Each structure stands twice: as structure tokens, then as C-alpha cells.
Amino acid sequence: DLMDKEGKGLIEATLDAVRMRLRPILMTSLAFILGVMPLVISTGAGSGAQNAVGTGVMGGMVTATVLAIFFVPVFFVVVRRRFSRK
């Protein structure tokens, strides 16, 4: 929405985009993990199925944000896929 509508930014539009939304990526991710916290442990008798659900998403969200918003793709991708050839 910045590349087309506004200005290109070969690498300075993807970087300028997270400059104005590191907030909601860590607002959802942090609030989600805390809402799944009661299932991961806490309840340990009433229903053991709670532990089966919350373990598979709490572990997956730490790695789907402290990884996505950084280091490995979700930034790197848009570079080599759109740019670099066509």
C-alpha cells in the first residue's frame, strides 16, 4: 500500500511498513499466549485435553512472531520474490 499508492521503496517500503506496525504484531501475539496460558498448564485434572491444545499453539506463536517479525522471512521473502527479477 506504500509501494504502489505512495512511494516505491525497493527495500525502504517493507522497512517503513513495520516502522508503523510493530505494535499490533506484539499486541495480538502477547495477548493470545496469555489467553492460552490457562490450558498449557494451570488446569491439571478437570480436563487433560486443555494441555493438548494450548501446548501446540503457545509453542507455535513464540516461533511465529519472534522469528516472523525478525530473523527469518516475513521481510526477506518480499525482497527475493517480488524484486530481484519481476
Partner: protein
């Protein structure tokens, strides 16, 4: 679902909150052109979640 529920609500509210600071503007029209950026996703994500 609770997770994929307050997430969709989060993007609508806080993207206005930046629009009310980036270019300090409280009014109704601040909320309208916030959906210029968001609406494109809103329906897009709805399809790929399905």
C-alpha cells in the same frame, strides 16, 4: 477461536490509534481512511483463513 477473534478486532482499533498520532486526528474521517489500509487485508485474510 478466542485467539483468532481479538486479533481481527486488534487491527481495526490500533491502526486508527496510530492515525491519531502519526497525523494527530481524532475524528470520524480518521477512522474512515484507516480502513483504506486495513479493508484490503480484512477480506483477503478472511478467505485464506477459510
Amino acid at each position: 477461536a478466542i485467539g483468532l477473534l481479538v486479533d481481527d478486532a486488534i487491527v481495526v482499533v490500533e491502526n486508527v490509534e496510530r492515525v491519531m498520532a502519526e497525523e494527530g486526528l481524532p475524528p470520524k474521517e480518521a477512522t474512515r481512511k484507516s480502513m483504506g489500509q486495513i479493508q484490503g487485508a480484512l477480506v483477503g485474510i478472511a478467505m485464506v483463513l477459510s
